[PDB]
């Protein structure tokens, strides 16, 4: 998996975003970015791999009620099942701004 | 923790982003957004809490070499330590575009 560095150049990291110019199959290049915040997590001071998002394996995300995030997500078996999570668990209103805690 | 829904309204989810209009302490409101992709992960078809990013607890992120993400991250003890992770582990160049896998 991975190995982007072998066929890209001018890579850079700003905040949580990686940007790089990479070779296309038919030749030529393309510059793109990827937000890692959603991949990499801090576990007791050490950066560890998680998934890079959940939107890559889940679809039809919706706000159910006033604080429930609902979606259809893929299982290890590659099948979609219904799931939900209460955003009130960790999303707070800090003086008018939504913040994770 | 959390409980944003109690003092906000007009909440909505689009993709991985939650947007809501929330009450400020001094009165009045503010509309803000938060990208959950970095919080919530899909574990075998079930949405689970992770952290919402790593940029909230890590600082001085830098690209070391051609594929290493380096940063100073907080431990459980609230102290900053040096850490790094090889982005080549999971970031690939798919026909010119950076993608997690």
Domain positions in chain B are 1-101
Residues B23, A92 contacting (CB under 8 angstroms): no
Q: Which residues on chain B are in Cβ contact (under 8 Å) with A10?
A: none
Burial state string for A25-61 with b = 16 or more CB within 10 A and e = fewer than 16: eeeeeeebebbbbbbbbbbebebeebbbbbbbbbeeb
Closest CA to A36 of B22, B87, B11: B87
Total beta-carbon pairs less than 8 A apart between chain A and chain B: 266
B34: CB partners within 8 A, 6+ apart: A91, A98, A99, A100, B17, B18, B52
Query: By three-state DSSP, how is residue A40 classified?
Result: strand
Which chain B residue is nearest to residue A99, measuring alpha carbons?
A: B34
Which of A18, A39, A1, A53 lies closest to B68, judged by CA?
A18
Q: Give the sign of the dihedral formed by CA B48, CA B49, CA B52, CA B58.
A: negative
Pick the CATH number of A1-101 from 2.30.60.10, 1.10.150.120, 3.40.190.10, 3.90.245.10: 2.30.60.10
Q: Name the pairing type of β-strands A46-49 and A58-64.
A: unpaired
Neighbour order of strands in the sheet with A68-74: A58-64, A68-74, A80-86
Out of A8, A79, A92, the one facing B1 most closely (by C-beta) is: A92
Q: What is the DSSP letter of B52?
A: S
Helix (H) or strand (E) holding B21, with range, is strand B17-23
CB nearest to B89's CB, from A2, A58, A100 = A2
CA A100 to chain centre: 15
| Experimental determination technique | NMR
Q: CA of A60: which chain B residue's CA is closest?
A: B15
Neighbours of B100 (CB within 10 A): 21
């Amino acid at each position: 998996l991975g190995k982007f560095s072998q066929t890209c150049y001018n890579s850079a990291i700003q905040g949580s975003v990686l940007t790089s110019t990479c070779e296309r199959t038919n030749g030529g290049y393309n510059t793109s970015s990827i937000d890692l915040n959603s991949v990499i997590e801090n576990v007791d001071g050490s950066l560890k791999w998680q998934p890079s998002n959940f939107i890559e394996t889940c679809r039809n995300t919706q706000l159910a009620g006033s604080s429930e995030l609902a979606a259809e997500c893929k299982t290890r078996a590659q099948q979609f099942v219904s799931t939900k999570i209460n955003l009130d668990d960790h999303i707070a209103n800090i003086d008018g701004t939504l913040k994770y805690e």
